[PDB]
Amino acid sequence: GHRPVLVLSQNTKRESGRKVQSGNINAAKTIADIIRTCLGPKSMMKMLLDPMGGIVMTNDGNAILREIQVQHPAAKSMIEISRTQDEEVGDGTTSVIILAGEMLSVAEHFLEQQMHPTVVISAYRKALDDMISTLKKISIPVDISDSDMMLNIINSSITTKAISRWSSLACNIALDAVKMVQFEENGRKEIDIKKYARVEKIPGGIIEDSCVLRGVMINKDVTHPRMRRYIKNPRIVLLDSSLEYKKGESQTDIEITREEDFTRILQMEEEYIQQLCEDIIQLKPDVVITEKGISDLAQHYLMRANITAIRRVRKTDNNRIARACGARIVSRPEELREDDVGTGAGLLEIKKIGDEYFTFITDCKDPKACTILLRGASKEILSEVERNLQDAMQVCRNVLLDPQLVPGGGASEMAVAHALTEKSKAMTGVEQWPYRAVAQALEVIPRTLIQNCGASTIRLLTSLRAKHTQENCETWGVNGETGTLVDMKELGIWEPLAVKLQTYKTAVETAVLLLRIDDIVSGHKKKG
Amino acid sequence: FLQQYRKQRMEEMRQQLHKGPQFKQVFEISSGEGFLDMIDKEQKSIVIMVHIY
Amino acid sequence: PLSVFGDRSTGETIRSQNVMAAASIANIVKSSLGPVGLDKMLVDDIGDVTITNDGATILKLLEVEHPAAKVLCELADLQDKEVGDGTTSVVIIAAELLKNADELVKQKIHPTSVISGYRLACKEAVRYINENLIVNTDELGRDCLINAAKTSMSSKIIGINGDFFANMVVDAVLAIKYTDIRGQPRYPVNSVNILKAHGRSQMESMLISGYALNCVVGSQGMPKRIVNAKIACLDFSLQKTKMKLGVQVVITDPEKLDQIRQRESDITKERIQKILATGANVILTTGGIDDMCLKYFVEAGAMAVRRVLKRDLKRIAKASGATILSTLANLEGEETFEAAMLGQAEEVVQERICDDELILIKNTKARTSASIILRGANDFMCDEMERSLHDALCVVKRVLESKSVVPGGGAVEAALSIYLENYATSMGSREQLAIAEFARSLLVIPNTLAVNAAQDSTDLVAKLRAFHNEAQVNPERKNLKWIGLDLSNGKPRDNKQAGVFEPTIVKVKSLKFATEAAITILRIDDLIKLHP
Ligand SMILES: Nc1ncnc2c1ncn2[C@@H]1O[C@H](COP(=O)(O)OP(=O)(O)O)[C@@H](O)[C@H]1O
Ligand SMILES: Nc1ncnc2c1ncn2[C@@H]1O[C@H](COP(=O)(O)OP(=O)(O)O)[C@@H](O)[C@H]1O
Ligand SMILES: [Mg+2]
Ligand SMILES: [Mg+2]
């Protein structure tokens, strides 16, 4: 048809200049303002409606941000920052977004004037280095062997979540899970909360009945009623290969001419099943767990040896059982060895919860994996409880790997801001203004805590700044429940240094990344 | 009672806990020629599902 | 009269159209030049976001329709392929050359005369660069490579952290040095595996003294760390044996079926038994490994990795001294594995990186390898980090291969402009005008640099030209050839002393490619656009 001469495509949109920078900064500010009120011990929860019909009720920043679909690429960058913070340290997700928004605001203040973004970026990087130095300076060590202090750290981590009502139970569950899943092999230490330390939520009951199991629990039942549903000291054998006759890999058509060959073939199928079962029985086990199917004839031959069999178990669940009971998964039954038999599980029991059967292996001696059994009001309540427990376990692992500890309640923010402000007095350049501005941008955390508590922001923040101008007041923060100044070595709110370092680094680098853009091109085909 | 598909519930479970990054949105075709050259182009051995709504 | 089903544009109309297209392509990326340039953030139709400063990436992601604009985009791609740096500069120079050539043509100067003048100017500029503006890196030492990396990484997301990233780049490039035949050292960049993982700050990016694998162990029962690794690299899968299409199994006596089915896996069992019996600790294969073989490796207490990339496996094998085996077949018709096929490394570890795990092969023997793990705030920032890191690696490779460098900051452009303006008066009468326009168009680089910093471009360029004219005229002022632009303070500066260096190949190739593209576009004076 009509042909208009064009360089780029019709659907290609390009904008540049101060408009792009202002749009990016306001997008980041809006993203921060979305979750501004979900920070602190007095945070309010939010209902998120899934596009799939689900409901998410949470005050965690990452879930709220991941449930929101946005068009502006700056908001997408902010959501990616939230996800990065969640994946790296598992805490501080709400704080990093607010910090990035405040830093971008104070940067926009300078970009309105005739200051180039590169100068602001260099000042921001200098400030970030100084913040890291100050945070490492004001940190204090912790004794990992002290269970009380670890429980206190986990509590101060979870005081801002809905699970804070059952603080002691949640802290004990998280500490026990992290401690027992901790592993050491070949000179390489690991925690691996992701693979092991599985959280299983069964709606109903009371949350005070939730506990961490000394072993693994799965939603499975015996393959046949004659199986024993209660074994005192079981010997467990784990497999992946099916216990049933299966076709080979190659095309293996038979040609039957004699009369008895058909019955002979069926008899050898049965004999092969019997041989596999006898090879299993030779180790004299009590429980056989398979990731794949178990034939009925195999069940009968296992019963002849009084062996309980469970089939169709997930690979992750089977690995967890192997870690818990100290067994090794074996593919070919004829290659079973004595050390592959799992001895160490002190009880196996299949009990009925509600209208379902659940398999419990919950008396292991020194188990390296666990199931956190969560019981509660409903599915959404248990999902929020699981998220809070995940936060607690992440904080526990962070403390275990890095025993440095940092005062909370905004005390660290004010201390770092004061140190950077004092340091900025001896530079006498053009970068001192952005340096000081991004230093004072850290005060958005105590300000947010005061705002959420409902107290007077200006008076309390001025008093806190005046206190931090003194000679030893690095641990003075705000009480987020009463809206009063308090020493954090008395209140007891402390946070891992790793979380604070990650939060500051991520916020500063988000500001730096969003400050480097002045041109936006959109609408072009993906071309691939 | 295997037909009742107890496994459907856990299928929904890990479909809900599927991934970490953003889940993206369904691509929307705005022009008839867009649909025509979307189906005409792209690799032949790849299934394309279109939802009229 | 023609009766051609299409549109026809002839003469000044098509010439102006081509110049407009080239100028639009240039103006797209002119804002991303020099240390005071700023990145661009591109969004696809499916919402994918790319934040980049590289000209080649921008022009590749853009969807372009005009043929001259396509020529400029392919010019940027070619400059990226053959040099790796100066992708924006070549596009800007080519567009400015085309614009000035069209301005000359509009004055009834024949395009052939302009093309001849452009060719003469390019040849003389290359000769003058090679004879006057090059600096030998032998007297500069290792600091020359650091300075070149710093100059390359300016305007990038890793510019401020250049003090760290330049050392990382130089160490990575020096770790892969080798000498081929003729005794010429070679630096095979793209052999440095780059892994991107969001998480900690930029300054905590790691340079691995070995190789980094984006893979994990096949089974959870395998150890995650082996001290004295004996790496075996295989190019075949370890699964249950299956006969080919030409072989069929037909059973007439039933008693043979069980033996057939047993051998069907005993074959792979025997192969793995040989491989483990030679003493190997780490097994890497490009093919898959099924559960039975994984359990064999688990019982052996060895690390097995499946679906390893072919390039990664080749790099690991040659760094560790191993040999890729696509089959365990020797020249005697048997099935053997020898210890001489085993590579060695000081450690093989599966480490955790931001809630994910990757495999590090540390300190491979008989050859030094290098890998870089980039840490950033999110995926887009890591991608830009990788692009900038690749640019720096290419720049360092060019500097190390050819030991000549030229001052940056537009010093070369100003010197060439002055010299060619002087030289045009000695050649022809209209090619004189063409060479003068070539010299004038070479000044678009310092002009754009000054404009990006909001500095007085006119005054700074005038001062630079005065300095270079004094250098060329006065015989004892030859030290002024290094006077470039200091964009931080907006003043001329001796860039050779300041450490703003570029490889000579970047400037030479950019000049040649831009001249050829400008000549190609200037060769058109009629366009027939056939209707589809
Ligand atoms: N009892 C308390 N008094 C004052 N501040 C607190 C208290 N408990 C927690 N905080 C502060 O609240 C912040 C935690 O808020 P939270 O909702 O966890 O956000 P994020 O998930 O981003 O960490 C911490 O920085 C801590 O300093
Ligand atoms: N530190 C510096 N000071 C002054 N000029 C610089 C500096 N670093 C780079 N430049 C100049 O900026 C110009 C643009 O480089 P850049 O656009 O980043 O590379 P490319 O052209 O490969 O994209 C180069 O020609 C170089 O001479
Ligand atoms: Mg928290
Ligand atoms: Mg460059």
Instruction: Give a three-class secondary structure readout of A70-136.
Output: CCCHHHHHHHHHHHHHHHHCCCCHHHHHHHHHHHHHHHHHHHHCCCCHHHHHHHHHHHHHHHHHHHH
Of C33, C464, C510, the residue with max ligand 2 atoms within 8 A of its CB, to mutate for a pocket test, comes to C33
d(Cα A135, Cα A129) in Å, to the nearest integer? 10
Amino acid letter at C439?
Answer: A
Q: Which two tokens stand for residue A68?
A: 């929101």
How far the first Cα of chain C sits from its last, in Å, is: 21
Are residues C370 and C207 in contact, defined by beta-carbon separation less than 8 angstroms? yes
Closest CA relative to residue A86, chosen from A409, A333, A387 = A387
Tell which residues of chain C come right before a gap with C–N over 2.5 A.
Answer: none
The maximal CA–CA distance of chain B, rounded, in angstroms, is 49
Beta bridge partners of A217: A360
Is C391 catalytic? The answer is yes
DSSP per-residue codes, A263-316: HHHHHHHHHHHHHHHHHHHTT--SEEEESS-B-HHHHHHHHHTT-EEE----HH
d(Cα C504, Cα A283) in Å, to the nearest integer? 74
d(Cα A396, Cα A389) in Å, to the nearest integer? 10
Residue A492 region by backbone torsions, left for phi larger than 0, else alpha for psi between -120 and 50, else beta: left
- Which residues make Cβ contacts (< 8 Å) with residue C266, sequence separation at least 6? none
Closest CA relative to residue A44, chosen from A487, A498, A516, A453 = A453
Are residues C393 and C169 in contact, defined by beta-carbon separation less than 8 angstroms? yes
Q: Which chain A residue shows the shortest CA-CA distance from C9?
A: A5
Strands (E), A50-175: 55-58, 140-141
Q: Which two tokens stand for residue C341?
A: 């096929």
d(Cα A468, Cα A471) in Å, to the nearest integer? 8
Amino acid letter at A377?
Answer: A
Distance A158 CA to ligand 1 centre (A): 8
d(Cα A12, Cα C440) in Å, to the nearest integer? 33
Sheet with strand A13-16: strands edge to edge: A13-16, A517-524, C39-44, C49-52
Q: Which two tokens stand for residue C331?
A: 């020249």
d(Cα A88, Cα A83) in Å, to the nearest integer? 9
**Whether A117 and C38 lie within 8 Å, measured CB to CB:** yes
Q: Which two tokens stand for residue A103?
A: 């830093």
HEC per residue, C1-23:
CCCCCEEEEECHHHHHHHHHHHH
Radius of gyration of chain C (CA): 29
Q: Which chain C residue shows the shortest CA-CA distance from A122?
A: C160
HEC per residue, A202-227:
EEECCHHHCEECCCEEECCCCCCCCC
Q: Which residues of A are annotated as part of the binding site for ATP? A: 40, 92-94, 409, 480, 495
C450 lines ligand 2 (CB under 6 A): no
d(Cα C72, Cα C91) in Å, to the nearest integer? 6
Distance A447 CA to ligand 3 centre (A): 17
Are residues C142 and C466 in contact, defined by beta-carbon separation less than 8 angstroms? no
Burial group, residue A163, by CB count within 10 angstroms (0-12, 13-18, 19+): buried
Are residues C408 and C147 in contact, defined by beta-carbon separation less than 8 angstroms? no
d(Cα A265, Cα C436) in Å, to the nearest integer? 95
Strands C282-285 and C229-234: parallel
What are the φ/ψ torsions at residue C196 (nearest 5 degrees)? Answer: -115, 125
What are the φ/ψ torsions at residue A15 (nearest 5 degrees)? Answer: -140, 150
d(Cα C421, Cα C54) in Å, to the nearest integer? 32
- Which residues make Cβ contacts (< 8 Å) with residue C141, sequence separation at least 6? none
Handedness of CA C308, C313, C319, C320 (dihedral sign): positive
How far the first Cα of chain B sits from its last, in Å, is: 36
d(Cα A199, Cα A371) in Å, to the nearest integer? 6
A contacts of B30 (beta carbons < 8 Å)? none
C154 lines ligand 2 (CB under 6 A): yes
Q: Which two tokens stand for residue C47?
A: 């919402």
Coil/strand/helix, residue A199: strand
Closest CA relative to residue A40, chosen from A153, A159, A168 = A159
A203 membership: H or E segment, kind and range: strand A198-203
Are residues C132 and C140 in contact, defined by beta-carbon separation less than 8 angstroms? no
The one-character DSSP state at B53 is -
Q: Which two tokens stand for residue C7?
A: 């549109």
Amino acid letter at C293?
Answer: C
d(Cα C354, Cα A440) in Å, to the nearest integer? 30
B contact chains, 3+ CB pairs < 8 A? A, C
d(Cα C16, Cα C20) in Å, to the nearest integer? 6
Q: Which residues of A are annotated as part of the binding site? A: 40, 91-95, 160-161, 409, 480-481, 495, 500
d(Cα A44, Cα A163) in Å, to the nearest integer? 13
**Whether C378 and A190 lie within 8 Å, measured CB to CB:** no
Tell me the technique behind this structure: cryo-EM
Handedness of CA A461, A464, A470, A474 (dihedral sign): negative
